[PDB]
Amino acid sequence: DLTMIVGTYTSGDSKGLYSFRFNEENGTATALSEAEVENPSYLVPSADGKFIYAVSEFSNEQAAANAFAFNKEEGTFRLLNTQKTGGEDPCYIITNGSNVVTANYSGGSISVFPIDKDGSLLPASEVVKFKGSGADKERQEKPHLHCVRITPDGKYLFADDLGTDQIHKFIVNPNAKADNEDVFLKEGSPASYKVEAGSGPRHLTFAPNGSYAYLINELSGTVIAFEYNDGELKEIQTIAADTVGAKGSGDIHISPDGKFLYASNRLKADGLAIFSIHPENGMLTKVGYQLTGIHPRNFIITPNGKYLLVACRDSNVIQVYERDTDTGLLTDIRKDIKVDKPVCIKFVP
Numbered sequence: 451d452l453t454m455i456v457g458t459y460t461s462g463d464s465k466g467l468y469s470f471r472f473n474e475e476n477g478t479a480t481a482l483s484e485a486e487v488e489n490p491s492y493l494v495p496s497a498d499g500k501f502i503y504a505v506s507e508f509s510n511e512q513a514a515a516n517a518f519a520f521n522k523e524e525g526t527f528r529l530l531n532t533q534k535t536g537g538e539d540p541c542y543i544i545t546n547g548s549n550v551v552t553a554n555y556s557g558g559s560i561s562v563f564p565i566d567k568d569g570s571l572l573p574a575s576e577v578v579k580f581k582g583s584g585a586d587k588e589r590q591e592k593p594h595l596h597c598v599r600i601t602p603d604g605k606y607l608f609a610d611d612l613g614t615d616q617i618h619k620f621i622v623n624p625n626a627k628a629d630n631e632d633v634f635l636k637e638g639s640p641a642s643y644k645v646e647a648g649s650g651p652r653h654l655t656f657a658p659n660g661s662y663a664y665l666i667n668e669l670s671g672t673v674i675a676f677e678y679n680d681g682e683l684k685e686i687q688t689i690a691a692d693t694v695g696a697k698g699s700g701d702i703h704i705s706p707d708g709k710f711l712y713a714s715n716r717l718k719a720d721g722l723a724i725f726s727i728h729p730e731n732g733m734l735t736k737v738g739y740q741l742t743g744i745h746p747r748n749f750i751i752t753p754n755g756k757y758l759l760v761a762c763r764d765s766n767v768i769q770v771y772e773r774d775t776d777t778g779l780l781t782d783i784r785k786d787i788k789v790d791k792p793v794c795i796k797f798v799p
């Protein structure tokens with residue numbers, strides 16, 4: 451079976467991280483262990499699955515990135531250390547094996563943490579702060595970094611800024627590590643790529659073919675499709691994922707076969723919008739819509755592409771939907787995984 455890690459908001463019953471075994475052939479999950487850490491909103495396992503890095507989303511000086519040693523054979527967690535981010539509300543985290551990068555929502559910045567030899571985190575190495583505002587007076591008063599993604603080629607990093615309707619561009623130094631002083635992230639050219647005012651860039655994902663990227667906009671509720679090549683994003687299409695103006699869109703994922711794209715919506719008509727991906731031009735065509743549990747801030751598709759699990763924060767459950775290989779449509783198999791406020795799901799490679 452696969453090993454599954456679940457992040458939560460810990461104000462209620464949840465204590466932090468939760469590990470499970472997940473059978474991707476019949477959708478059954480078996481609980482393993484847990485790790486007490488506050489607000490592990492987003493997390494990412496190391497390529498070898500020996501470590502797990504999770505944020506501690508706080509709107510104060512407690513905001514941090516946590517380093518965990520992970521024994522998947524036992525399914526247990528071992529906290530190594532915690533380092534402060536440069537800014538408030540870190541809500542997305544990634545690792546290139548040498549450094550961990552955090553996107554700070556309230557700080558309007560991104561923080562880089564070099565990884566020590568033992569897998570723990572050295573203190574924040576680089577903290578890039580952004581400035582600006584947007585169309586929406588309430589939600590775009592200043593920058594709000596919601597996502598960081600290293601391109602398929604590994605030479606660049608894009609940081610979605612919901613507060614200024616931009617996707618900031620950086621050049622990635624593959625040789626930057628804790629051993630040297632090589633700058634890991636450097637401002638690229640151009641400094642960013644702009645999207646329609648009021649969009650509210652949230653999450654960005656890349657297609658398996660590595661030639662296209664898709665963005666889900668939290669405020670506008672649209673999905674913008676981009677052609678991608680050597681650090682360049684060119685807009686090819688915009689389409690609505692949310693059609694009721696809920697201004698609460700969330701996550702975005704493409705099925706392993708690259709034939710379908712899913713985008714989640716919250717606040718009104720909670721669910722996922724389902725699109726077919728053109729095999730030649732990568733453009734999207736809406737084919738269905740699935741109402742889910744309440745507040746689907748995050749979801750994931752199993753490696754074999756058979757199941758799609760949706761973390762429903764307000765319904766306190768992770769719903770399991772079987773995917774129809776040919777239509778992309780979903781079917782609830784009734785195997786809810788109960789957990790208080792789940793907001794992130796990952797599998798251990």
